[PDB]
């Protein structure tokens with residue numbers, strides 16, 4: 038036995054039992070831990086949230102140091118201590134109704150170490166790692182406690198808990214056996230733990246110069262499974278564990294080995310991470326999540342006389358001189374109402390914008406600004422991307438193994454804006470591929486034994502230079518683009534950006550740019566910060582604007598005028614797709630003004646946007 | 655003793671359901687068959 | 703030879719990702735879209751192992767669907783060799 042382990046276990050029990058602290062100004066001195074024991078008993082939960090600072094304040098941090106430095110050995114001792122604490126206080130929830138496997142998920146650790154910063158000395162210790170979720174596995178049952186049936190002296194014996202390696206009971210229900218031939222498991226009596234292996238990439242910001250993003254495989258168990266999202270930045274807290282590796286046998290350098298009749302085992306390992314706490318880095322739900330400070334900010338923000346213009350000027354601070362493009366990007370960010378018909382048709386409810394313009398017109402700047410600002414957004418370039426990248430892909434589970442689905446760019450931008458930079462240079466096959474998904478919002482993979490139907494409700498923001506690298510004055514927009522007229526028809530807004538030799542605008546833009554290089558910040562101050570914008574967009578998204586009966590007429594005559602005006606030759610011909618687009622923009626405008634009913638002003642704004650977007654030859 | 659033995663011909667054909675009468679969303683289903691002696695080399699592939 | 707009972711209208715409905723492990727050895731009602739069929743395959747239902755040491759075939763033993771039972775010892779003559787199956791006498795069941 039180990040004296041230190043038992044002593045630390047009982048010290049942990051005592052510290053938990055006598056934990057004390059003042060609770061704010063109200064609640065007096067509240068034993069937060071002991072009271073939260075019954076708080077989680079109310080729902081009979083399985084997690085006990087051990088904030089690190091609590092464990093750190095006591096015993097001058099010696100208990101925290103012992104737990105962090107040698108967590109793997111202490112964890113069963115802490116489990117026994119927690120069971121004893123439940124026995125002494127609040128024993129009403131111990132039974133599952135065998136015994137619930139309570140999870141001790143630490144958090145609020147001092148520092149978070151990157152994937153590149155993982156070290157071989159700190160294995161067996163507790164830390165936090167931050168990375169991007171790229172591949173996740175199924176929720177496969179994992180054998181934790183097993184029931185074994187002895188081939189000899191046959192019977193059923195449970196409570197033979199499973200270790201990391203297979204374990205079978207040496208003692209038998211009939212002791213005369215003492216033989217372990219074919220100890221057989223059974224479904225109804227064995228105990229299992231939920232399991233999930235999530236692959237994480239190194240974050241882009243922390244990538245070393247001239248290096249590839251190092252990856253890692255993270256194990257999820259208990260109630261923490263199925264929490265991460267592919268393409269969602271998340272932090273993982275737990276212990277570094279080693280797992281057997283059969284690949285690194287031909288690598289240079291000597292190898293660990295054993296001798297016991299050769300009695301030799303080839304010993305290689307690769308480092309993984311077992312995680313306990315993972316977090317992601319109705320309008321009433323969003324309102325409930327909203328704090329009152331913001332709720333009231335929102336109230337004066339909502340009751341502003343001119344909220345549309347102030348929202349427009351608050352988007353894309355870096356770019357100067359483009360207002361209609363800012364309006365379009367704002368509408369795309371807000372989105373639209375996804376409506377389903379009784380006959381099965383799923384009406385499109387997101388805005389797709391193709392921005393064409395002369396070189397050096399902040400188009401790439403718009404796309405870069407949108408990403409990193411719009412939640413669940415992906416930025417890609419035209420040439421360095423493929424269909425397996427834009428759409429979902431198929432790749433092996435592990436090297437020399439079966440294949441699996443790979444998260445594509447479109448899905449990583451599901452219910453988000455995907456920014457496709459340099460659309461024209463991107464290959465025609467991948468063009469068919471992106472457009473095919475855009476038509477039905479669903480990307481299907483039918484290769485290598487997988488026929489999953491993968492949906493992607495993504496608004497596409499496309500940028501492309503005119504053919505020849507310069508807009509032809511004579512030719513139209515369709516004549517200066519390499520995509521087809523149906524591709525024009527699918528896309529909603531065409532913001533053809535042009536360059537002109539106007540002295541005033543040149544002087545003002547030069548002043549703006551040299552000031553932006555001058556004042557690293559405060560060069561231009563948008564009325565609304567990122568947080569306020571994000572929240573407003575989130576709140577507006579929750580509302581679902583409804584079309585009033587009166588505005589339907591105004592739509593009808595506006596579409597009549599739109600059909601009459603052209604070809605009485607323009608960039609895009611007038612079709613019904615346009616009338617759908619008129620609503621698609623109207624719902625976004627209504628969401629912007631935080632209104633619930635469509636008014637003729639909204640149709641006026643949408644028709645203004647569509648009449649300005651169309652360009653005379 | 656191979657010089658005093660006697661042998662027979664055996665052939666493995668494969669049968670697939672006629673592609674005309676196939677459910678639209680499903681791959682065709684095939685069947686493995688054997689064959690012996692005078693039935694061997696009686697059908698070329700592509701014969702109903 | 704046998705009859706079956708098909709339960710309908712179970713109260714609780716769980717999605718595939720929500721099965722977790724508590725639903726183990728439990729009746730569940732889930733919905734989805736069918737993707738792949740594996741055809742119709744005969745599966746052993748009433749297997750009759752034969753004992754060449756006895757002289758003839760043994761009795762029809764019910765085959766558990768969890769795993770394939772084996773004749774390690776012949777309870778009659780203690781034969782270690784013959785535990786094969788005769789596809790003519792064996793009664794099969796559909797499987798997909």
Ligand SMILES: Nc1ncnc2c1ncn2[C@@H]1O[C@H](COP(=O)(O)OP(=O)(O)O)[C@@H](O)[C@H]1O
Nearest residue numbers: 355356357358395396397398399400401402403
């Ligand atoms: N209206 C503008 N406002 C702010 N910056 C601009 C503007 N026009 C050009 N620029 C600047 O000049 C550069 C142009 O880059 P950009 O237009 O995004 O490349 P591309 O034309 O290939 O999309 C950027 O640094 C951008 O900030």
Ligand SMILES: [Mg+2]
Nearest residue numbers: 400401402458
């Ligand atoms: Mg560009």
Ligand SMILES: [Zn+2]
Nearest residue numbers: 187189209214
């Ligand atoms: Zn035994």
Ligand SMILES: [Zn+2]
Nearest residue numbers: 753756776779
């Ligand atoms: Zn026998």
